[PDB]
UniProtKB/TrEMBL annotation, chain B:
Name listed for the protein in its UniProt record: ORF25
Organism: Human herpesvirus 8 (HHV-8)
Residues of the full protein shown: 51 to 99 of 1376
Superkingdom, natural source: Viruses
Length: 49, 49
């Protein structure tokens, strides 16, 4: 029983891993979308006037 | 003629729990440590991606 129930703790923690490494995928790609459309200050400041 | 003398006491010092150095260490009293051979701590660091 302690071999079974210690192997179901492996496969959940191998699969909590799978979802919670995909919530990092949101935060990566959303930040990488912002950096593709973020020109620097010195270019954009004089265009702001 | 019975002669008496003057003795000065040993100047005592603050014990270890009443010094502020024990904020840096965690104190346990292991009664029989001369029987111990080794002691270990085993970390298991899971890593997300």
């Amino acid at each position: 029983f302690t071999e079974y129930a210690g192997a179901i703790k492996t496969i959940t923690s191998a699969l909590q891993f799978g979802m919670d490494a995909l919530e990092r995928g949101l935060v990566d790609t959303v930040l990488a979308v912002k950096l593709r459309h973020a020109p620097p200050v010195f270019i954009l400041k004089t265009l702001g006037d | 003629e019975a002669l008496l003398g003057v003795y000065t006491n040993v100047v005592e010092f603050v014990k270890f729990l009443e010094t502020a150095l024990a904020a840096a260490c965690v104190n346990t009293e292991f009664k029989d440590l001369r029987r111990m051979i080794d002691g270990k701590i085993q970390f298991k660091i899971s890593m997300p991606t």
